[PDB]
Amino acid sequence: DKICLGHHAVSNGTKVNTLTERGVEVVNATETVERTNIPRICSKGKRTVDLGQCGLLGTITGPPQCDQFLEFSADLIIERREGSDVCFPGKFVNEEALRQILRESGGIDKEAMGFTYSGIRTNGATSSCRRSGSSFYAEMKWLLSNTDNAAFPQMTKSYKNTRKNPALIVWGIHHSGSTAEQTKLYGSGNKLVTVGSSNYQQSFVPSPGARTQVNGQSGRIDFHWLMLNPNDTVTFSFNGAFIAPDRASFLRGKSMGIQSGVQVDADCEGDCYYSGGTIISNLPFQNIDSRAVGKCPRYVKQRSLLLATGMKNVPE
Amino acid sequence: DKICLGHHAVSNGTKVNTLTERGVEVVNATETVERTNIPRICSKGKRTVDLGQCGLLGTITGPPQCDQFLEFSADLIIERREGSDVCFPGKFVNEEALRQILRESGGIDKEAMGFTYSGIRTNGATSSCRRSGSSFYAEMKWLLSNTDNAAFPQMTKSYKNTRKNPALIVWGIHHSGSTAEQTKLYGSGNKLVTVGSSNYQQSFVPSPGARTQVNGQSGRIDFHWLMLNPNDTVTFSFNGAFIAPDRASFLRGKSMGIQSGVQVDADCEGDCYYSGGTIISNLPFQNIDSRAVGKCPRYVKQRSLLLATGMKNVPE
Amino acid sequence: DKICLGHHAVSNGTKVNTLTERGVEVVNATETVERTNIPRICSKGKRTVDLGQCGLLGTITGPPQCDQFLEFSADLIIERREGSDVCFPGKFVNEEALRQILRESGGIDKEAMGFTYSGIRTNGATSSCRRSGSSFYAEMKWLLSNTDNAAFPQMTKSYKNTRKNPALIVWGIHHSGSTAEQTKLYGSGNKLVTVGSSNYQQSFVPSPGARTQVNGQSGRIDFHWLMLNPNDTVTFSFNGAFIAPDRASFLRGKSMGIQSGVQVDADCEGDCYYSGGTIISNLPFQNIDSRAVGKCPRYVKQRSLLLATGMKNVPEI
Amino acid sequence: AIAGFIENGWEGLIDGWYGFRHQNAQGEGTAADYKSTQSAIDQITGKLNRLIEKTNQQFELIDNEFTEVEKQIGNVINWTRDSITEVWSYNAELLVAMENQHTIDLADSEMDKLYERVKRQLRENAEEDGTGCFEIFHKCDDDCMASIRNNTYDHSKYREEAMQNRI
Amino acid sequence: AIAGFIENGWEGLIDGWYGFRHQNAQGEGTAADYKSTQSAIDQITGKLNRLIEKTNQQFELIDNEFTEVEKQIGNVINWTRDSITEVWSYNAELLVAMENQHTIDLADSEMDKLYERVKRQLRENAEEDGTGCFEIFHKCDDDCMASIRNNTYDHSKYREEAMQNRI
Amino acid sequence: AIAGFIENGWEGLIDGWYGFRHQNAQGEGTAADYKSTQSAIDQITGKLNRLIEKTNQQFELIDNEFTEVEKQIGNVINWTRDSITEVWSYNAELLVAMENQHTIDLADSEMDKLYERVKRQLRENAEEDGTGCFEIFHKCDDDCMASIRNNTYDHSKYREEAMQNRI
Numbered sequence A, B: 001d002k003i004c005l006g007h008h009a010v011s012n013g014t015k016v017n018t019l020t021e022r023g024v025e026v027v028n029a030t031e032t033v034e035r036t037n038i039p040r041i042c043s044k045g046k047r048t049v050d051l052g053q054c055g056l057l058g059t060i061t062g063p064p065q066c067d068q069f070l071e072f073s074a075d076l077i078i079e080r081r082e083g084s085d086v087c088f089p090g091k092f093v094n095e096e097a098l099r100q101i102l103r104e105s106g107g108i109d110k111e112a113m114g115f116t117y118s119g120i121r122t123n124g125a126t127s128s129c130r131r132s133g134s135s136f137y138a139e140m141k142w143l144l145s146n147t148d149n150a151a152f153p154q155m156t157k158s159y160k161n162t163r164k165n166p167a168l169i170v171w172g173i174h175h176s177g178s179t180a181e182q183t184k185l186y187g188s189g190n191k192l193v194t195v196g197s198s199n200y201q202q203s204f205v206p207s208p209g210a211r212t213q214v215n216g217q218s219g220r221i222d223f224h225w226l227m228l229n230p231n232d233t234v235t236f237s238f239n240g241a242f243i244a245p246d247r248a249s250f251l252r253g254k255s256m257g258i259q260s261g262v263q264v265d266a267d268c269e270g271d272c273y274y275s276g277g278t279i280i281s282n283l284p285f286q287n288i289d290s291r292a293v294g295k296c297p298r299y300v301k302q303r304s305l306l307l308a309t310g311m312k313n314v315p316e
Numbered sequence C: 001d002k003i004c005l006g007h008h009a010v011s012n013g014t015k016v017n018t019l020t021e022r023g024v025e026v027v028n029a030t031e032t033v034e035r036t037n038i039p040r041i042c043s044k045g046k047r048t049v050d051l052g053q054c055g056l057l058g059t060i061t062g063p064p065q066c067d068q069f070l071e072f073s074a075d076l077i078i079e080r081r082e083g084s085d086v087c088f089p090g091k092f093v094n095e096e097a098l099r100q101i102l103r104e105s106g107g108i109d110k111e112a113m114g115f116t117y118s119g120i121r122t123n124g125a126t127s128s129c130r131r132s133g134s135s136f137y138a139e140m141k142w143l144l145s146n147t148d149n150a151a152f153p154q155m156t157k158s159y160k161n162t163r164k165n166p167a168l169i170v171w172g173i174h175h176s177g178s179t180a181e182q183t184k185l186y187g188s189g190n191k192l193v194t195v196g197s198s199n200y201q202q203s204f205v206p207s208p209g210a211r212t213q214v215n216g217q218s219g220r221i222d223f224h225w226l227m228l229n230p231n232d233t234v235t236f237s238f239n240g241a242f243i244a245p246d247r248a249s250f251l252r253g254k255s256m257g258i259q260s261g262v263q264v265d266a267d268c269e270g271d272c273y274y275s276g277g278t279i280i281s282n283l284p285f286q287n288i289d290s291r292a293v294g295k296c297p298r299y300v301k302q303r304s305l306l307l308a309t310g311m312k313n314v315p316e317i
Numbered sequence D, E, F: 001a002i003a004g005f006i007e008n009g010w011e012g013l014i015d016g017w018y019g020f021r022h023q024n025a026q027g028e029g030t031a032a033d034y035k036s037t038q039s040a041i042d043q044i045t046g047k048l049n050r051l052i053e054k055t056n057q058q059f060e061l062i063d064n065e066f067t068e069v070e071k072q073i074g075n076v077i078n079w080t081r082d083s084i085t086e087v088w089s090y091n092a093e094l095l096v097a098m099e100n101q102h103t104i105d106l107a108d109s110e111m112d113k114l115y116e117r118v119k120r121q122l123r124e125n126a127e128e129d130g131t132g133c134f135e136i137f138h139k140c141d142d143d144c145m146a147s148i149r150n151n152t153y154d155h156s157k158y159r160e161e162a163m164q165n166r167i
Ligand SMILES: *[C@@H]1O[C@H](CO)[C@@H](O)[C@H](O[C@@H]2O[C@H](CO)[C@@H](O)[C@H](O)[C@H]2NC(C)=O)[C@H]1NC(C)=O
Pocket: C291, F065, F068, F069, F071, F074, F075, F078
């Protein structure tokens, strides 16, 4: 008698958008924008460093917060909000670029340079590090001359960078808290530091600080960043205040390290990280955070975009 | 008999682009690229400051031409081509960053620095800046060494930011334009400036020499600026050339600053401006100017794009 | 009788990617992503300067490698890896901005600076820059003290730009290889160079010390530059260790630059170039070089995207 | 005398876009179909509401026109701005061409929906003539033409005379 | 009582997406069309497999949350990031809206091609009812319902009876 | 057994994209159409010409490959360039996928437009088989086959013969 062709329906479906109208009801649709995050870092199968009170930029310099993490290899490097890059107060002159390469550096390897002269006192008494007593960073010397009324000798120390890898050279300049400190801690007179290379050619001069008492001590450290190409030579020609590195830093490889505020979960794996957690979904878009690292869904502003998987729902 | 089905038509339609043919004629289409604008800036509903003959940084520095804007409060900030940031020749360092901050500041809430000086003169009147007689900048204190031919004493001043918003502190360095003038003004000897805060560290050195003549003067005063986080302190250690701030500037809220060469008009109430006029339209695209500010159409290269609103035109 | 309709089909065919399904067979498809290149520069129709050993920035200062390029005029500028910007060791400060300025400049039109000197040696030379045995940058003056181990008097010089175009003015600061070098030349004492104009103000100080040998002398010159607006003036004030300009550099017009390692080909005309060749194609995309410059296809990461030109190739029994 | 949508368009419909034209005892009657027109207009209006929508992301000045900015950052800004302009010029050209194609295909689909609906109402009497019209084998008066214009038409009762005329 | 895809769907068709409903004197029932549902679900699944393709591009952090970047570079970065976000938000909304339009139109295309397949299999021994129903003008039970679902039904079954039944 | 269109296609058609194949007792054979072929190829070439999209925006060289740029701006350039590249790779894959879907749907709809034109042009003088042929009840050779291949065919002169059959 009668036959009929028709299609399935549901009593109540979901609503998707189309090119000509909004709120089109379909039987089934899925989400294309991820909204659910994992509160913890999914680092399973990858080597990680969970760096706490120490910041990432300090892995070269060696603040007491991460003395044990001076030399390591890693696949994922994690910096924390509480992390600090100083013992004695200071800042890097090109802080963001150096951090950017460290997050891409894969870790750190080191090779000693030297500064094997006399008249110099390695410890450099600072009261902001209490691992055993007054000291400066594990990897740097304060060339303070022969205590009081001691002129600083002229030094011309170079490093040849004999390995095939480019060398990361980090050194610094000490801005004392006052003119009296320049006079008695590094001796009287003017202070000049000249740093040469095939491509650097830059001089620095310290000045009396008279700055606020950040972490008790006034003054600042300028951490200066230099890159060497294979077989190049870095030259440190100076007679002024100088923070002498003991070891040059070299890269390891890939990292894509992520700054994060949450605990590390070693039992889950994924590649998208953000400061508030991770994304382990395979949806094309997210509205969780735009500041994603790795093979991550693309950031959009819409809270949710539903992609239809069924056909138009016309209920009976 | 016969029933015929069909559609309307027009005698003269317009042409639109399609995926298979560039020139398909349609019965009706609208424009999606706006070229119409209003010759005047629109301020209805927004507080507008018109900095006629005044640069935006003159609301911080305070040259005579900006005397009415030292504590301006506005939602829309209009800079003029004919205006100037200074009255006595000079340039700001990172002036682009400072304008970017000020154009979004919501206006400037000035608060006294509270600096008290002794052993100097706080006048510094110059013939290039006049208010019915020789004057200097309203917000800057040019500190000279007593009368003439005397050493300038070193002074170390500081200011603490006690408000919830970050404080903007601006100061300058005076390059006398002659070694003889610098030694008459601030006395003989080496000059050194150190300025800093918990997240800021800079030093400056006056540089006498010879320079060209602008507004009859040979010297140049350059200006520098610092942001203080809440509860942070700034120090100013100088051996001369203070160009000291008299008041700290706080940001009132949020604004959108613009550049314009045309008159302001209350009536239109537009949401986006460009130099030379206002763009008031609902279209998704514009071909007026690429340097647009506000929530307004995205710039495209096409002079016009026509979006069909009716069906295709079959002229018979 | 039976009248059958149908469509052209092929025994082989190709495959294309669609929005819904991958690998859909079609009778014919073309490529929209260019993978072919020409390993040479198609410079036909444009004035081209092939800066073999000459770095682009040396075309302002004039090292021996740039002897023939001191007043070059060209529409297309080709840079090469084997060239150098300097002859005496050194570098430009903000060198990338200056290279970007020069690449579109259209060439260089030099005008005499008009600086008259007295009491000094204006004929300084170095063993690293050998035009005829011992020389220095042709277009800049190495200003020494009257004698070795003697004072260099302070001088102020200025230039007024009387042309309608802004002038590009370059000067060097010489950082000596030792305190003796800065004492043997120019004389003892602190040195200072100040440069300014109505909208520009900088101050430079040389810093003697010690450096590794690069291309001979263990010294360095930092090359600084300014743009001078029309009807403005520039004042140079120096006490020594200042390399003065001899001529002001005006820009000629419009050009584009190339960084490449390949032969210049004057018999072919292309639309854009990259380090490995010229890209001549009417396809909207390319997968060969993401940094090609000029008017040419946009780079995509897809090795090949096949755009159907025929219909779906349903096979016949 | 009067052709349908396949052969050509028809000048004369001022109220609406889609409609019906017929030859009968009264002669060359013309009327518009306001329901298919409102459907097409509603879908086009929604399409424009999505396209004619402004963003809420505010942008400020990055560079200056009264004074120049640092040349390297200025050139990076100009390159990024030009690449964004190229992206939006591509997106605008593709959006306008694609949506114009969808608008034209939309109008043709709505014309087809009307045509097919009439065919399904007429059943064995539809007799498509290849010009976008339906030949009615029964003698149809104004009331049945009006019944065709809206959605309430009986294919029965007419079938007997229509098939006697058709066969 | 019985109505097809033209006006309504089937709330009771859970096993399969496309199917046939049989109303006769010889019982009543519903059976799915395996090939049509299998094609539609595999075709949509392929669409999803395209949507979930990963970028395969690792992005490093450029900005810095814990310590701010310079205001000039930070403002250039925020301008670039916001322009990129607007481009991807535009592309995401256009892609989802366009693909939802294609999914709905594609499902309707499958419905129409299956409907036309049935019409061309029945030819002159059946007529459309305008609702999704086909009126069968010969007596038949589930054996031919299965033959239609199996794409095996032939129209050469006492055609003259159906013609007399509809002439 | 010449019924290519619905299922098999014609691998033997040389001169055009669309055509006619004849089963007539005088001798079977194949011929191509040129008007629907020319229309489809003109639209596809129009697509390729639109898709050239040659830019008139000159881009200069910012990143120096001989001497590296400062690392912070270098990474800004790499991030911006990679985001732009991802945008263009997405746009290229989506554009090609859309154009391939529209090219296939266009070509298949062009074959359907020709098929529908033939069915309506033949009025009730032919019956669909459902595999890709029209069963013609009236036998004819050169005038009717040429007229059907063309856009001008008079269905009246064969209407009586076709209506005498089947009944
Ligand atoms: C990222 O930025 C660095 C410099 O800051 C740049 O070297 C990278 O690309 C370089 O591209 C060159 C030509 O395309 C190539 O020869 C060079 O090897 C390559 N750099 C490296 C380390 O391999 C920039 N990345 C990209 C993707 O361009």
